[PDB]
Design a protein around this ligand. Structure first.
Ligand code: MG
Ligand code: ZN
Length: 164
């Protein structure tokens, strides 16, 4: 329908094995009242490329922040306390959040706190009247076959922490 949000974020890809490396991908994210989708970004023409994936807003169960990595690469280092910068806002994505649905959590990294806050508020908005909304979540990432919060090995494992 109408695009509520358009952003370039770092997305962690669907992990292939517990001993296969983590691929991060810079993607164009669109949010409508109906769909949340990622596209390839045509940087040269300044537009969205092929549609990489779409999640029906109704199948979303949860949206929150994630506890950030302990030793992130410079690409995801959270800067010290205290305007925009054209380069750093498409090169540094330090601020993670998770979109939980039927097939586990999708991890997205925002270049700013403000852009992450904006995305979480708007998604919480469009999912409010969902049937399957959950009251528990994993505050930490699912890394190398387990949640780092509760060592649970199922991806769609019940959240180890209750939402406040
Ligand atoms: Mg445009
Ligand atoms: Zn957990």
């Amino acid at each position: 329908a109408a695009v509520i949000l358009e952003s370039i974020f770092l997305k962690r890809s669907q992990q292939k094995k517990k001993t296969s490396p983590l691929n991060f991908k810079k993607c164009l994210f669109l949010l409508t009242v109906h769909k949340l989708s990622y596209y390839e970004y045509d940087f040269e023409r300044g537009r969205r490329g092929s549609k990489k994936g779409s999640i029906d807003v109704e199948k979303i169960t949860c949206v929150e922040t994630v506890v950030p990595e302990k030793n992130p690469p410079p690409e995801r280092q959270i800067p010290r306390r205290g305007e925009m910068e054209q380069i750093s806002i498409i090169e540094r994505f330090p601020y993670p959040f998770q979109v939980v649905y039927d097939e586990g959590p999708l991890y997205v990294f925002s270049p700013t706190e403000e852009l992450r806050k904006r995305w979480i508020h708007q998604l919480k908005n469009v999912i409010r009247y969902n049937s399957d909304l959950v009251q528990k979540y994993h505050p930490c990432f699912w890394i190398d076959g387990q949640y780092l919060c509760c060592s649970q090995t199922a991806k769609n494992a019940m959240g180890c922490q209750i939402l406040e």
